[PDB]
């Protein structure tokens, strides 16, 4: 019915008017490319040949467009159509008369997409504004879209079969809009959290931590090769940090050339000892933490997720705030190129040798588990004798579960800490966790020491059978193993019952993901529809479509969210 | 023992039998995170291999068969009953877990191009097209014949030379996109000759005809099935996954010279990023690489039953130490480009990798001024129909947040469904307009002078007309 057509989603009101299928759009799998800049995207040749951007013939560009017309559709840098002044369209594929090929001012030649054509790149779902960014086009000879790895974090895209949509603006006006509003370098900092959206990620982060250690010393030729990939190099080789006996540069010395202009920033490495700041060696840090950059030169410090990541006050954030968006784009690209070419010399890996720990550490983990199981047994015996006293506001069952969970969690965390102590400097799990590229201390602990308690619906594994978790356990068994505690690590391997309980926990995680996608989508759509028309007028009042004043000044101070920074008042706290 | 239960009434035959068919192919399942086993169960259904030994006789749509399937070097005991050895899906690959050039970052994979040249992960794609000569129509007969442009009033300019006399292309003939696989003609009633009814190859198939069969179907009409074969060499978009839930595309392909090499000369067929392992906690992958190295040297297929208690990482490491390698499986690698030893020692070992059905050639689509829908006069939908990608409501909200009003206007009006209507000035209702006659008149007012041209999306015109059919009057007044 008419109401049925209009009412539902995919109806005329919403499926055909608010959104609709569009021309000049392309889609294919995305794959990585460290060599492309932040703003560049690698387009396949077939996609580039199908998509055409009409160019008006001017006296300036008549020769170039004439050559493109002569090439035709078959040769790649060719023209698919000629649009005359009258509006007549001459498809060049089917034979055009040699008279038709002649061009005069006012004709519109539809050239194939070429290098440097601005496009809009999208990945569904388009949760935020950074999910559609304007990219320059670089044609490369394979059939996948190729984007830089730093740009993956705004899109929330990884290269495991993901896909993205390419929209080509068809007019100079909309092309200029994209160029000056939505290009990737212009949207490095989000107004949502006044932090940079994009940061150094994956291999480059892990390798920048290693590159910036005090230990790293580079010889002459390696410095030559690293400087070769630095796009903004002045052509002057820095004086080596160690002139004699053999000239040897340092990783910080080369990274200082990457840092844009003169940027001043102080950040702390992840492994920074808390006591260091108060005690001596505060400025001469024993562990080479406390990153300090003075005059755009890395005086000291080990770079990590905090310094080069997506957080307020990061080196990239200070670069965008101080130097500008263009120099910051160069900064991202140069970090990636130089550090990735050093990683060929150094290299990274993950093996079983990382998961395995010392025998003493394994014995300590086993002893912690033994005494934890004994403590849970003692709590159970107290509950059976009714000696346990209920916690206020909780039933005796609830307080018994609380105490048992406290004991098991303390044992779990203690075993994890012992495993983390066992890790050597060379351990690669620790490399990735310390750099912040991937993983967490929890993952190391589960890999090496103890997987932990499996909880479903916020409680230990429930009694699915009559008064017992699995048929193998005895009725009314509240002990650690029965209710889901996984004593073995992933390396050691889960026992069959622990395997099933772990499967139950993982299933709960999967279900939560599936549910959260839909519920969050609905919430986001409702918010957008409620506030779509609100905007800052030229009075600088924030008004809706009806012109009712929502706010007299935007944010009550009339400032935009990206420019602001965290600061301390310093008059508030001190005593009189 | 220390008394726990003295009244056992039954015993499990083997705990590994709790797993199903797809989870039984996972080696060392108990050493992986649970979501990863769940993901591998889904990925294993999409792997490529010989699906059935009678595949030559079968004419199925979308059949993929790998050139050189191999049985796993590290296999579960329960795989024997699944017949996985008889019909394997995947190839044991020397896999190095390393960061080489940054093209293996995220979940992508660097593959050896020389290995790909030697047959590594090469597959065939068979697609079958069926057509039926239907004489059921009263005066319509869908005869199989080769259409002729002069004889048939309805025709298309695609290549018709391939068709033989019967209207069916012979086996062994290369077919490129937009070629006529089967030629069929419907005799046209002469109300007062031929509307073309040929079937055309899916774009970019680029295959060679394998088999052409002519039979009579259940209805007794002549039935023709044509199978087109396309070899599929792995590319830099194809999706490859291991048995431990690690899926990823091919980032780039380096030749054997460029790939890092051990001192023995072994270059990894596949390089995977070390960053995939820690967050996902798929230690079963690492133990499978270690056991695969030990198995390849020893010559016995390794045992990876879930719950064994006789196979430990330490035992595998000692076994590998006997065969002259580092006990943990690390190997000293040399950089292919410069020849210098890589300072970190890279973990290299054989690992069963699979090739999933998702390939970039099937998933690449581009649209530019294509056909439009009938009802909405908007671009079609789907790769088969050359459909444009949808600019959803979330996309338009992003563009509003940008402040790109003109790009939004182009994408939502000019690129999709531009249209022009004539609207009376006195009454907002649309008015009849004869451009060729140059006479524009509005019914209901008896007014000709006051008419204005309005540019609106065709979908909006359809919306207003559907409102009018419900007796709502959307009077759009320019004033």
């Amino acid at each position: 019915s008419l109401k049925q057509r209009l009412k539902g989603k995919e109806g005329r009101v919403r499926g055909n008017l608010m959104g609709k299928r569009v021309d000049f759009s392309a889609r294919t799998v995305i794959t990585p490319d460290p060599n492309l800049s932040i703003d560049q995207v690698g387009v396949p040749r077939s996609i580039a040949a199908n998509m055409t951007f009409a160019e008006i013939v001017t006296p300036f560009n008549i020769d170039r467009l004439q050559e493109l017309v002569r090439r035709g559709n078959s040769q790649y840098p060719g023209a698919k159509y000629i649009i005359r002044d009258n509006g007549d369209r001459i498809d060049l594929r089917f034979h055009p008369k040699p008279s038709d090929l002649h061009l005069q001012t006012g004709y519109k030649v539809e050239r194939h997409m070429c290098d440097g054509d601005i496009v809009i790149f999208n990945r569904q779902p388009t949760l935020h504004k950074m999910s559609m960014m304007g990219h320059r086009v670089r044609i490369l000879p394979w059939s996948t879209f190729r984007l830089n790895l730093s740009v993956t974090t705004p899109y929330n895209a990884d290269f495991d079969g993901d896909e993205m949509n390419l929209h080509l603006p068809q007019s100079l006006e909309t092309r200029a809009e994209i160029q000056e509003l939505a290009m990737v370098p212009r949207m490095i900092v989000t107004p949502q959290s006044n932090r940079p959206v994009m940061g150094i990620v994956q291999d480059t982060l892990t390798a920048v931590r290693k590159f910036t250690k005090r230990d790293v010393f580079l010889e002459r030729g390696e410095v030559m090769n690293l400087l070769m990939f630095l796009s903004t190099w002045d052509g002057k080789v820095p004086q080596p940090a160690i002139l004699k006996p053999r000239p040897l540069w340092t990783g910080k010395q080369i990274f200082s050339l990457i840092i844009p202009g003169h940027i001043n920033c102080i950040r702390t490495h992840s492994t920074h000892p808390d006591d260091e700041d108060s005690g001596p060696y505060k400025h001469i840090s024993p562990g080479d933490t406390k990153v300090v950059v003075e005059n755009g030169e890395l005086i000291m410090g080990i770079l990590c997720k905090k310094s080069l990541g997506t957080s307020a006050g990061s080196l990239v954030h200070i670069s965008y705030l101080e130097m500008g968006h263009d120099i910051t784009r160069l900064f991202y690209s140069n970090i990636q190129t130089v550090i990735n070419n050093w990683l060929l010399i150094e290299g990274h890996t993950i093996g079983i040798g990382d998961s395995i720990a010392d025998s003493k550490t394994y014995q300590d983990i086993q002893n912690t588990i033994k005494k934890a199981k004994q403590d849970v047994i003692e709590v159970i015996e107290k509950a059976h004798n009714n000696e346990l006293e209920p916690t206020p506001g909780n039933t005796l069952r609830q307080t018994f579960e609380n105490q048992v969970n406290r004991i098991l969690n303390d044992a779990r965390d203690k075993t994890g800490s012992s495993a983390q102590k066992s890790l050597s400097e060379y351990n690669n799990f620790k490399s990735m966790v310390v750099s912040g590229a991937k993983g967490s201390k929890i993952n190391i602990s589960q890999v090496i020491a103890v997987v932990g308690q499996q909880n479903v619906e916020g409680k230990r594994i429930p009694f699915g059978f009559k008064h017992r978790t699995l048929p193998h356990f005895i009725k009314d068994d509240y002990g650690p193993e029965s209710r889901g505690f996984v004593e073995n690590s992933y390396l050691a391997g889960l026992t069959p019952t622990e395997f099933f309980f772990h499967a139950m926990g993982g299933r709960e995680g999967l279900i939560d993901t599936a549910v959260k996608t839909a519920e969050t989508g609905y919430i986001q759509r409702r918010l957008i529809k409620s506030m779509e028309s609100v905007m800052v007028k030229y009075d600088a009042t924030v008004r809706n479509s009806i012109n009712q004043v929502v706010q007299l000044r935007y944010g009550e101070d009339g400032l935009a969210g990206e420019s602001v920074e965290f600061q301390n008042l310093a008059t508030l706290k001190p005593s009189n | 023992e220390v008394a726990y239960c003295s009244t056992y009434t039954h015993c499990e035959i083997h705990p590994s039998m709790i797993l199903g068919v797809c989870a039984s192919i996972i080696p060392f399942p108990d050493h992986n995170q649970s979501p990863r086993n769940t993901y591998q169960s889904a990925m294993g259904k999409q792997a490529m291999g010989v699906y059935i030994t009678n595949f030559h006789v079968r004419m199925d749509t979308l059949a993929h068969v790998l050139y050189y399937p191999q049985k796993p070097l590290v296999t579960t005991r329960s795989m024997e009953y699944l017949r996985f050895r008889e019909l394997p899906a995947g190839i044991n690959s020397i896999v190095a877990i390393a960061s080489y050039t940054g093209y293996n970052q995220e979940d992508s994979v660097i593959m050896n191009r020389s290995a790909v040249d030697r047959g590594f992960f090469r597959s065939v794609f068979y697609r079958s097209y069926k057509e039926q000569e239907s004489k059921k129509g009263f005066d319509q007969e869908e005869v199989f014949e080769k259409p002729t442009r002069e004889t048939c009033q309805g025709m298309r300019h695609a290549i018709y030379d391939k068709l033989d006399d019967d209207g069916l292309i012979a086996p062994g003939v290369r077919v490129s996109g937009d070629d006529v696989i089967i030629g069929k003609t419907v005799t046209l009633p002469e109300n007062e000759t031929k509307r073309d009814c040929s079937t055309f190859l899916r774009t970019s198939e680029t295959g060679i005809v394998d088999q052409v069969m002519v039979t009579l179907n259940q209805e007794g009409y002549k039935f023709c099935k044509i199978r087109v074969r396309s070899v599929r060499i792995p590319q830099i978009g194809d999706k490859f996954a291991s048995r431990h839930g690690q899926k990823g595309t091919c980032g780039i392909q380096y030749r054997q010279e460029d790939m890092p090499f051990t001192c023995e000369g072994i270059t990894p067929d596949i390089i995977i990023n070390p960053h995939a392992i820690p967050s996902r906690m798929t230690i079963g992958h690492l133990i499978e690489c270690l056991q695969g190295k030990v198995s390849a040297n020893k010559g016995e297929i390794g045992d990876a039953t879930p719950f064994n208690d006789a196979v430990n990482v330490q035992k595998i490491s000692n076994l590998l130490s006997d065969y002259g390698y580092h006990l943990r499986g690390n190997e000293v690698l040399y950089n292919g480009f410069t020849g210098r030893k890589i300072t970190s020692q890279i973990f290299i070992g054989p690992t069963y990798y699979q090739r999933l059905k998702h390939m970039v050639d099937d998933k690449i689509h581009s649209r530019a001024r294509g056909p439009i829908q009938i009802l909405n006069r908007q671009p079609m939908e789907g790769r088969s129909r050359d459909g444009g990608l949808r600019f959803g409501e979330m996309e338009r909200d992003c563009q509003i947040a940008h402040g790109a009003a003109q790009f939004l206007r182009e994408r939502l009006f000019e690129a999709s469904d531009p249209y022009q209507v004539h609207v009376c000035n006195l009454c907002g209702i649309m008015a009849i307009a004869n451009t060729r006659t140059h006479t524009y008149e509005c019914r209901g007012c008896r007014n000709k002078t006051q008419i204005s041209l309005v540019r609106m999306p065709y979908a909006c015109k359809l919306l207003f007309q559907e409102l009018m059919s419900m007796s709502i009057a959307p009077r759009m007044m320019s004033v």
């Binding site: 969970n405 098991l408 969690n409 779990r412 929890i442 589960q446 997987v451 932990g452 308690q453 499996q454 909880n455 479903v456 916020g458 409680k459 230990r460 996984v486 772990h502 926990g505 993982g506 709960e508 995680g509 939560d512 | 995170q33 649970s34």
Partner: peptide, 8 residues
């Protein structure tokens, strides 16, 4: 899969 306070 860790604990009651963590993740499943």
């Amino acid at each position: 899969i860790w604990g009651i306070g963590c993740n499943p």
